[PDB]
Design an enzyme around this catalytic site. Structure first.
Site, short mmCIF file in Angstrom:
data_model
loop_
_atom_site.label_atom_id
_atom_site.label_comp_id
_atom_site.label_asym_id
_atom_site.label_seq_id
_atom_site.Cartn_x
_atom_site.Cartn_y
_atom_site.Cartn_z
N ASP A 1 -0.02 -2.29 1.68
CA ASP A 1 -0.39 -1.00 2.21
C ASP A 1 0.15 0.18 1.38
OD1 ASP A 1 2.09 -1.85 3.39
OD2 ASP A 1 1.89 -0.33 5.00
N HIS B 1 12.86 -0.99 6.58
CA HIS B 1 11.67 -1.82 6.62
C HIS B 1 11.58 -2.81 5.48
CE1 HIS B 1 7.41 -2.76 6.88
NE2 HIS B 1 7.32 -2.46 5.59
N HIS C 1 4.74 -3.52 -0.51
CA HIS C 1 3.72 -4.15 0.30
C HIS C 1 2.32 -3.60 -0.05
CE1 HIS C 1 6.72 -5.34 3.66
NE2 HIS C 1 6.62 -6.30 2.76
C1 XB4 Z 1 2.63 -7.69 12.11
C2 XB4 Z 1 2.59 -6.37 12.82
O1 XB4 Z 1 2.68 -5.37 11.80
C3 XB4 Z 1 2.56 -4.04 12.15
N1 XB4 Z 1 2.50 -3.74 13.42
C4 XB4 Z 1 2.47 -2.44 13.76
C5 XB4 Z 1 2.44 -1.47 12.78
F1 XB4 Z 1 2.44 -0.16 13.16
C6 XB4 Z 1 2.54 -1.80 11.47
C7 XB4 Z 1 2.60 -3.15 11.11
C8 XB4 Z 1 2.64 -3.51 9.70
C9 XB4 Z 1 3.48 -2.99 8.70
C10 XB4 Z 1 4.64 -2.06 8.86
O2 XB4 Z 1 5.32 -2.19 9.92
O3 XB4 Z 1 4.96 -1.28 7.92
N2 XB4 Z 1 3.19 -3.50 7.49
C11 XB4 Z 1 2.17 -4.42 7.64
C12 XB4 Z 1 1.58 -5.23 6.66
C13 XB4 Z 1 2.00 -5.22 5.20
C14 XB4 Z 1 2.99 -6.37 4.91
C15 XB4 Z 1 0.85 -5.16 4.25
C16 XB4 Z 1 0.57 -6.08 7.10
C17 XB4 Z 1 0.17 -6.11 8.47
C18 XB4 Z 1 0.79 -5.30 9.43
C19 XB4 Z 1 1.81 -4.44 9.00
ZN ZN Z 2 5.75 -2.61 4.35
ZN ZN Z 3 3.70 -0.55 6.35
#
Ligand code: XB4
Ligand code: ZN
Ligand code: ZN
Length: 232
Positions: A89, A150, A87
């Site tokens: 991030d 995840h 992803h």
């Molecule tokens: C949609 C809600 O997402 C989250 N909500 C609470 C969190 F603490 C983390 C995320 C989150 C995570 C992850 O859970 O790892 N990854 C994300 C990405 C990636 C695909 C680039 C984009 C946007 C949000 C997240």
């Molecule tokens: Zn992720």
């Molecule tokens: Zn993440």
């Protein structure tokens, strides 16, 4: 001023570091995605007179800011980076790293998924991680593949000198009430993968999630609990 950084204390476009242990920092940055703002973590581990980076700062400009912040606060060169899943991030910023002369690494699974997603692709492939429970050494860390959680490709990172477990996005912070972004998750396998982490790293003293505040081993059980309730 010494508290763990949050979106409210990181100026726009900036990155903060947090000392976790001797020779171990997390990095924290902010990004927007689908119109919402999120923090995210990575790791920095001292590797003699060089640094190993775990995960980008979620985006090209954030990652450039990360490199500048490292130069300011630590002053040692980042020579290698590992991305712990596909992803943005984790890999968004890999092109910036590569243009700064950092050698970028990820499992072949991560590299395939990143390519298919249209995300930036680490250069080098990390073999030896394709079966759950696999572990390999990489500089001052151990890389461990716990199984699908995840994401199918997620890796965790252990710093043995400090008993620091970097769970990445397979592990959630204690305050979390949902399982985060589950679009690519395996909610059924996730608890089993967490149990593997727990079994493999029973001496972990600090556990760092992919997003939010570090804590202790309780983050692991909490993660299993939040995932089970999301699945139901
Ligand atoms: C949609 C809600 O997402 C989250 N909500 C609470 C969190 F603490 C983390 C995320 C989150 C995570 C992850 O859970 O790892 N990854 C994300 C990405 C990636 C695909 C680039 C984009 C946007 C949000 C997240
Ligand atoms: Zn992720
Ligand atoms: Zn993440």
């Amino acid at each position: 001023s010494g508290e763990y950084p949050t979106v409210n204390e990181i100026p726009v476009g900036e990155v903060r570091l947090y000392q976790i242990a001797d020779g171990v920092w997390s990095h924290i940055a902010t990004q927007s995605f689908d119109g919402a703002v999120y923090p995210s973590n990575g790791l920095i581990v001292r590797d003699g007179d060089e640094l190993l980076l775990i995960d980008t700062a979620w985006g090209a400009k954030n990652t450039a800011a990360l490199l500048a912040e490292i130069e300011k606060q630590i002053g040692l060169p980042v020579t290698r980076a590992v991305s712990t899943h596909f992803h943005d991030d984790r890999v968004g910023g890999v092109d910036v790293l590569r243009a700064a002369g950092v050698a970028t690494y990820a499992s072949p699974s991560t590299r395939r998924l990143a390519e298919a997603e249209g995300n930036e692709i680490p250069t080098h492939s990390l073999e030896g991680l394709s079966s759950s429970g696999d572990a390999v050494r990489f500089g001052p860390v151990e890389l461990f593949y716990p199984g699908a959680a995840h994401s199918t490709d997620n890796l965790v990172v252990y710093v043995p000198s400090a008993n620091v477990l970097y769970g990445g996005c397979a592990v959630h912070e204690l305050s979390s009430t949902s399982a985060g972004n589950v679009a690519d998750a395996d909610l059924a396998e996730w608890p089993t993968s967490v149990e593997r982490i727990q079994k493999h790293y029973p001496e972990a003293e600090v556990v760092i999630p992919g997003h939010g505040l570090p804590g202790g081993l309780d983050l692991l059980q909490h993660t299993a609990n939040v995932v089970k309730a999301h699945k139901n």
